[PDB]
Amino acid sequence: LTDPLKEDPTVIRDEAQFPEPSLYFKVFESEAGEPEAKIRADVNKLYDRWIEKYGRRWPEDGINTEDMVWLAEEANKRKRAKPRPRGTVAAEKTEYEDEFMPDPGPRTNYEKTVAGGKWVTDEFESADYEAGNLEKLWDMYLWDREGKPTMMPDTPAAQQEGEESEDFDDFYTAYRPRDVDSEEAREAVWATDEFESDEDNTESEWAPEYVGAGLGLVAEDPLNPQYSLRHSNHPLAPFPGEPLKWASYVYPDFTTFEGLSKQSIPHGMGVMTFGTGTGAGFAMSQTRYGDKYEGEFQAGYAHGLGQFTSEASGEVYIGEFFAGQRHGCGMTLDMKPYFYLLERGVDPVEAYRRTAGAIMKNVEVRTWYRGNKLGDAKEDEVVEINVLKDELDDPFEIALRNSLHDAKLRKWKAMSPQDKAMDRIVSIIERVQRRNPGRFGAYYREDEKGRVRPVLDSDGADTDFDSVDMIQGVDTDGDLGPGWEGATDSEENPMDPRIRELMAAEGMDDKLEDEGFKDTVLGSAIINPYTGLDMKTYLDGKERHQAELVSVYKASREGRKYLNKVRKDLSREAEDDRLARLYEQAGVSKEDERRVEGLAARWRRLLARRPGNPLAANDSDTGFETESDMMEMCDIPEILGTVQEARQIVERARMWRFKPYGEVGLRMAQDANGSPVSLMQEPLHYPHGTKFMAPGPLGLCHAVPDDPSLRQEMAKVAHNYAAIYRMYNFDWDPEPGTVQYKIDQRIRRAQELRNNAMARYLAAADEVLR
């Protein structure tokens, strides 16, 4: 077969017009929040329509009267829920004539328009049609005979008290009978303009994605995974808009940064030296004057892989960073004695010989979580301990749980999407009720006299919900958490009981005052006139209180006598019988259940925080709020690999350190007396017999100064340069026994296998189609 990788490049000939019809006439789903694209979309449709009639993407005559009708109704359709018409009128036209508009290719508007329909007649104002649409949507009467609103206030808006006038097309749409959705409300009041009659909500506006390091992602194009970073601010995102710049910043506190930057923020790779203060997200107490961090930066944070070096203290850390703190695997060395001997006039070789062994013995490998070292709170043994705890249960519970695990999967495999949504809603409701179950049936009662009264508890509380945790939060178990100036490093030093009770009483009277203010401010408005639901209870979330109160009042003797006077002028049993039917239908008597319960409890349970793995990826019902304060600790090979890659990252990042003419280079490169020095970084001048450093033919003409350490350094630099070179230049005909040869062999094998698979698919298609 022909070699795909050895085609003769004698004649190169491409045929592609720059305004490419493949790339130009196309609408992307990536362009969703952009309004102008909508117009383009319609235009594109028109093009296709013309191609369907003339085949030239250009219309004879021009845009006709029926093109707008087609593009309005027939072109694109939107999802509705359900119609339910009727065939008989329920109103009378005996009132002032021309009150209701009449209602009896005539198929539709487009069919009539293409059959010679002028559509030129104009009549009536828009407000009448919008009011009629709202009235039919409500299925009520919103205006009386005189024309004054019946469901909204008709008096002029009081400028005092903060109220302002509101049009009907807004009030009758922001306040609706809950069987009308936002889309139908917008469609009823003729909201058509794309640019001015639409706004983006605070919680629904488009924002760039967050990908972090961007390692684990679904690749839309498998060959190039960088294509999936186009919607983020990742340093390697394609075409940011402004080129990444080699920033060399000196801050007023003498903190210096040198490396890649996006906009004006450090971004990509670089080296940062700390002066007074801090930077790169580090804590104020971590750094000193002269410490440095080399490695990856992201959004001004030391995020990724790097190395932190402190010349004053000697600590050296190599490894992973998240945000501005150590998070992941890391390796720690303490080279303090080496620096101590170096600063006291000892040559480096002698100091290394003296202090190599002690430093090598004290090398530490660790796993860090949010800047804290793990391994002291038995983080390593958590999983095994939890497995043993799960194994310590009674056999019946374990068997039932294991059967339920398979039953859930088998049930979910065959459910409909609507059934899945309902199931997830039920699960969410159950999870919520596991913390705050409503006091249904215990909100209102009747006293001895028969008067309805609220049902309080052993305290001054009507429901378990408190509005003070909204500003302070709640832990996983139920405790609140830190507050303003909470002090009490450990709460084993509690507050005095007298102060506690006094403050509790003061909080109770404050709650009473708050309730009084809320009532006197919001209780006058009416939300639901059928049940007397005011705005205060509606906005406090106590609608079920009113729902129970209505039934309690109507069932009371006083309520019954009032109803008589004005007239003068699931259940527990259902669940029980369903459970009994389920028990009977399976052939399991209650005696068997009692026997099994006795066997489990008296014979097994008497013989001798939810179950599961605390560190689990898939958890069915999660809530995305429970937080793990630990991670699987790195093993030695993983730490070694992390250090090996971090050293590569540091070496690659240390290439932005001495920009030729930059502020840091001009102001921080000094001799012994502190005066500036003329660094040999001229692009054309190589003085004092250093022309061997020229990376060209000129360098070969001159000789090296004959220093073994310099020769080793040059050899290492040459090795790095060759390693960089090999990644962009290949051989046309590789020799057998080399890596590139096996790569080419595998590529050819892949092509052959794909061709065979396609041939088999074609054979199957031919068999099916004939």
């Binding site: 190599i318 430093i359 090598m360 090398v363 030695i636 070694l640 090996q644 050293r647």
Partner: peptide
Amino acid sequence: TMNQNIVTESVKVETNQ
């Protein structure tokens, strides 16, 4: 219990460990 620095030697000794 051609040219390499202290970190490489320590990593190699741990790898042998």
